[PDB]
């Protein structure tokens, strides 16, 4: 029987390897433009620590498609089912929060002093998204461990002379639980930027997460449901090319749109403008 | 001696979707009977005046397509299951595009350009681009009859002591021939509402639209787990299912909260609320 896995002899590997090479180095420049703005209102407004690490968090990301490709090995199962999923995952829990921290912030402060007084000072919302983190390692690391680390194979029954081999055993119930705080994050920080897109808030970043958002749901929703109803050799690439366009969508989608404003409105680069927008 | 196996009309399911069949035609009829009341009502008008009345009207021809499905197969039936379903469903669709297209012309293209599209769409030319989306679909449904046909199936092994006949479709390209033009309808109204922000004391149009677009999409998208799960037997049950229930969604979201300010809150129809 013949073996089967992606290889640079295709098309559309080559294609998603092309992709995340104009993704890779669209947010290298993007990093690069950041690297001397530090302390410009927008770069200030963008988070601080967390702008910079959540760059360089997606910067190694992009390097999950040559680690993906070609004949798998262990060393790729522990990355493309831990690694990389963890690298996306704070990605995720950032913007979701910061969705949330824009929002019903008037709220914040009158009704609930109590926590409000407390929360402002030192850390404030990043402490939930440190424990989002932890609990999404809840699902991954402990779920490797259910699974085991393993190459595995498995049979396409059009003609079973041939055999996938795949670094994901289960792969639609271990998708399944993966997903599900996914799902949860999307749908969350979606509900909060869309009930806020009319806010001027951080240079209106509300408007940019609505959209990276409605992305991402929609391409889990679509890769589920594909999966669902789809089982033969293609879905390993299928789900490649999701994850690749999905950094994308993070990317260009919601940096991409402040660099825009960046380079090109040094009118809005003035630090007296930002009183304008609170 | 095999029984032969296929929906009987009194089954519970069967009898569950022409029920279901009941508030969907019976609220579309309502809803066309409400803009037959208030036809010349600026409400009317703000929502396209008679391509309101006509998208009603072809959503009813699209629930139409319901009775099709159950009872006894033939190879005519099976041709005309999908088709008739779908090219009544553009008819409708196509109208809440344009009314998702008026909104993007008002509230995000400068004013040079949009003082002169807004008369450029509406008149003769919102009736003939219903028309040409028409066309499409019509294309597209002679392509899928000539070249990618349903098959009767009659198969005499599959049950223990059944023969079960049913129409099978080709390749799912086949019926994903026939849910493109819908489908691209949908993603360009998305496109068009989503983005877009009003200013306060006008009527709130990309709202609906948007809600109309998303449970059309769930529907269609949960469709797809449940038709591949449930029996072979049963797969028309939730094809007709989606097509009552994707009615429903644009129902709910789009023509009856209109139909709520025009019975319930008639204030609102008045000419600068809209204009």
Not at chain 1, 117 to 132: D, E, N
Not at chain 2, 80 to 95: I, K, R, W
Not at chain 2, 242 to 271: D, E, M, R, S
Request: aromatic letters at 14%; charged letters at 10%; a positive charge.
């Amino acid at each position: 029987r013949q073996l089967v896995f992606l290889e640079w002899h295709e098309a559309p590997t080559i294609a998603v390897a092309l992709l995340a090479a104009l993704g890779f180095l669209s947010t290298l420049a993007i990093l690069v433009i950041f690297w001397r703005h530090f302390q410009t209102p927008i770069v200030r407004s963008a988070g601080g620590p967390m702008c910079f690490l959540m760059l360089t968090l997606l910067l190694v990301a992009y390097m999950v498609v040559p680690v993906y490709v070609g004949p798998p090995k262990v060393s790729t199962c522990l990355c493309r089912q831990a690694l990389f999923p963890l690298c996306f995952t704070i990605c995720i829990s950032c913007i979701a929060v910061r969705s949330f921290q824009i929002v019903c912030a008037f709220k914040m402060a009158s009704r609930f002093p109590r926590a409000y007084s407390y929360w402002v000072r030192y850390q404030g919302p990043y402490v939930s998204m440190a424990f989002i983190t932890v609990l999404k390692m809840v699902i991954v690391v402990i779920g490797m461990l259910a699974t085991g680390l393993s190459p595995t194979t498995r049979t396409d029954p059009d003609d079973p002379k041939i055999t996938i081999v795949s670094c994901n055993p289960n792969y639609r119930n271990s998708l399944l639980f993966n997903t599900s705080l996914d799902l949860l994050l999307s749908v969350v920080g979606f509900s909060f930027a869309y009930m806020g897109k009319e806010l001027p808030t951080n240079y209106n970043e509300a408007k940019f997460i609505t959209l990276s958002m409605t992305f991402y749901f929609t391409s889990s929703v679509s890769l589920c449901t594909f999966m669902s109803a789809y089982s033969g050799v293609l879905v390993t690439i299928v789900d490649l090319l999701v994850t690749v366009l999905n950094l994308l969508a993070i990317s260009l989608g919601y940096f991409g749109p402040k660099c825009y404003m960046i380079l090109f409105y040094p009118e809005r680069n003035t630090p007296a403008y930002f009183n304008s927008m609170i | 001696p095999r029984r032969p196996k296929f929906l009987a009309w009194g089954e519970p399911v069967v009898l569950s979707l022409l029920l279901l069949l009941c508030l969907v035609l019976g609220l579309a009829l309502a809803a066309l009977g409400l803009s037959v009341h208030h036809w010349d009502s600026p409400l009317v008008q703000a929502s396209g005046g008679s391509q309101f009345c006509f998208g009603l009207i072809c959503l009813g021809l699209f629930c139409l397509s319901v009775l099709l499905f159950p009872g006894r197969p033939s190879s005519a039936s099976c041709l005309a299951q999908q088709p008739m379903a779908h090219l009544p469903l553009t008819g409708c669709l196509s109208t809440l595009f344009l009314q998702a297209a008026e909104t993007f012309v008002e509230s995000e293209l400068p004013l040079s350009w949009a003082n002169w599209l807004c008369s450029y769409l509406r008149g003769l030319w919102a009736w003939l681009v219903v028309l040409l989306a028409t066309f499409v679909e019509a294309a597209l449904c002679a392509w899928y009859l000539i070249a990618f046909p349903p098959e009767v199936v009659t198969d005499w092994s599959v049950l223990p002591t059944e023969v079960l006949e049913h129409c099978h479709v080709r390749s799912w390209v086949s019926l994903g021939l026939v849910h493109i033009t819908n489908a691209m309808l949908a993603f360009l109204c998305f496109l068009g509402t989503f983005l877009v922000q009003s200013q306060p004391g006008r009527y709130n149009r990309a709202r609906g639209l948007t809600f109309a677009m998303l449970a059309y999409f769930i529907t269609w998208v949960s469709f797809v787990p449940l038709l591949a799960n449930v029996q072979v037997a049963y797969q028309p049950a939730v094809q007709m299912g989606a097509i009552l229930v994707c009615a429903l969604g644009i129902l709910v979201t789009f023509h009856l909260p209109k139909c709520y300010v025009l019975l319930w809150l008639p204030k609102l129809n008045t000419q600068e609320f809209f204009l």
